[PDB]
Design an enzyme around this catalytic site. Structure first.
Site, short mmCIF file in Angstrom:
data_model
loop_
_atom_site.label_atom_id
_atom_site.label_comp_id
_atom_site.label_asym_id
_atom_site.label_seq_id
_atom_site.Cartn_x
_atom_site.Cartn_y
_atom_site.Cartn_z
N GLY A 296 4.95 67.11 81.87
CA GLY A 296 5.89 67.42 80.81
C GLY A 296 5.59 66.62 79.56
N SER A 297 6.25 67.02 78.47
CA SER A 297 6.09 66.33 77.19
C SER A 297 7.42 66.19 76.46
CB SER A 297 5.09 67.08 76.31
OG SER A 297 5.44 66.95 74.94
N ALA B 296 9.50 65.08 73.23
CA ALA B 296 8.97 64.49 72.00
C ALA B 296 8.96 62.97 72.08
CB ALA B 296 9.78 64.95 70.80
N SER C 282 4.76 61.74 76.70
CA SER C 282 4.17 62.60 77.71
C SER C 282 4.33 61.96 79.08
CB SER C 282 2.68 62.84 77.43
OG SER C 282 2.42 62.96 76.05
N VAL C 283 4.50 62.80 80.11
CA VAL C 283 4.72 62.35 81.47
C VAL C 283 3.66 62.95 82.38
CG1 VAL C 283 6.33 62.25 83.41
CG2 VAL C 283 7.19 62.11 81.08
N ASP D 34 18.19 59.32 82.44
CA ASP D 34 18.14 59.79 81.05
C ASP D 34 19.35 59.34 80.23
OD1 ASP D 34 15.66 60.90 81.32
OD2 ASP D 34 16.26 62.99 81.05
#
Ligand SMILES: C1CCN(C[C@H]2COC3(CCCCC3)O2)CC1
Ligand SMILES: [Cl-]
Ligand SMILES: [Cl-]
Ligand SMILES: [Cl-]
Ligand SMILES: [Cl-]
Ligand SMILES: [Cl-]
Ligand SMILES: [Cl-]
Ligand SMILES: [Cl-]
Ligand SMILES: [Mg+2]
Length: 345
Positions: A27-28, A29, A32-33, A163
């Site tokens: 995944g990626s 603002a 990046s993961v 999160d």
């Protein structure tokens, strides 16, 4: 210092310690993961490379804030930090920050959308959210963004909060799940808000688990407010006194008055103890909402409540939030926190 190795994955350079293997973009603002296997601990992990962590004073401070908060959180129902590293050998060459956490699979969306949930499941899932929130709130931290996609769940129904709120105007506009779980006083900026904005969110989530449907799916801020006031009633003078904007008070007074609805006729067939708890969470006046610690002792959770196993947090010093520093000073503070990190057992 570990040995690092470099590689390019999806147009990004990743330089990480050898212990992290089989990196796979996921995944990626904010960054990046990649998913990876941590050969030191045996866990599959998420490795996040922060994007431009020190490009502005605002960004450098946000980087420091996220690192301090993740280093502090040590609780079974809250995401914690497994590792943090930089390939830099000195403050002079320091530019990149990588964060490592346990790899999470399903979130609560996948659970409520495509599963049959008994009342026993709802009890256990909400119990764990409140247990984590009691810990978080004990450190005078407010999550601010609790919603199903920020709750990780496994096959054994075990849950972690992730999160933390650390959002833009466009992201809260229209028919969007990002706003459906927010308390009205922060959605409309009525006043300075407390930690019970998170309890409002828990009520919205519990209602959705019980019914399979979003409680307040408004098409915009005003449509959502109208749905909320239809359920809980319009404000009385006591709460209106507490709203700061005269325009907001003016707008509220323009609406026809409505009584609170009967929640047993809204949540038809639900456990009467679940209905009782929802009435105590979904209160318009935030001063009067139940707290996380109070909710844990509610009879709905009698199966799981254990007051000797519901711990609180170590004190959390947030004095930096009022401090005015330069980019390089925020950057140096972050560097100290990276190099002083001590991994969990
Ligand atoms: C359980 C399933 C989710 N809700 C749906 C919501 C949508 O609009 C309202 C808000 C609450 C007061 C009535 C109107 O119902 C109904 C029952
Ligand atoms: Cl964790
Ligand atoms: Cl670097
Ligand atoms: Cl969500
Ligand atoms: Cl989990
Ligand atoms: Cl305000
Ligand atoms: Cl009613
Ligand atoms: Cl501290
Ligand atoms: Mg999220």
């Amino acid at each position: 210092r570990p040995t690092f190795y470099r590689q390019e994955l999806n147009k990004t350079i990743w330089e990480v310690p050898e212990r992290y293997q089989n990196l796979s973009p996921v995944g990626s603002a904010y960054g990046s993961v990649c998913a990876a296997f941590d050969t030191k601990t045996g866990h599959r992990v998420a490795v996040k490379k922060l994007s431009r962590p020190f490009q502005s004073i605002i960004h450098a401070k946000r980087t420091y804030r996220e690192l301090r908060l993740l280093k502090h959180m040590k609780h079974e129902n809250v995401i914690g930090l497994l590792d943090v590293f930089t390939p830099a050998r000195s403050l002079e060459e320091f530019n990149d920050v990588y964060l490592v956490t346990h790899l999470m699979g399903a979130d609560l969306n996948n659970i409520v959308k495509c599963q049959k949930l008994t009342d026993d499941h709802v009890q256990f899932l909400i119990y764990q959210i409140l247990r984590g929130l009691k810990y978080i709130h004990s450190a005078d931290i407010i999550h601010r963004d609790l919603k199903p996609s920020n709750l990780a769940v496994n096959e054994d129904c075990e849950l972690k909060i992730l999160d933390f709120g650390l959002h833009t105007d466009d992201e809260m506009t229209g028919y969007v799940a990002t706003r459906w779980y927010r308390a009205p006083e922060i959605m409309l900026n009525w006043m300075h808000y407390n930690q019970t904005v998170d309890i409002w969110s828990v009520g919205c989530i519990m209602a959705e688990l019980l019914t399979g449907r979003t409680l307040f799916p408004g098409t915009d801020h005003i449509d959502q407010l109208k749905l909320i006031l239809r359920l809980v009633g319009t404000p009385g003078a006591e709460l209106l006194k507490k709203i700061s904007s005269e325009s907001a008070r003016n707008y509220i007074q323009s609406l026809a008055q409505m009584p609170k609805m009967n929640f047993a006729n809204v949540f038809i067939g639900a456990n009467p103890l679940a209905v009782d708890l929802l009435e105590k969470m979904l209160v318009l006046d935030s001063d009067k909402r139940i707290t996380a610690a109070q909710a844990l002792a509610h009879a709905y959770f009698a199966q799981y409540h254990d007051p000797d196993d519901e711990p609180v947090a170590d004190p959390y010093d947030q004095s930096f939030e009022s401090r005015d520093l330069l980019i390089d000073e925020w950057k140096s503070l972050t560097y100290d926190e990276v190099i002083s990190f001590v991994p969990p057992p």
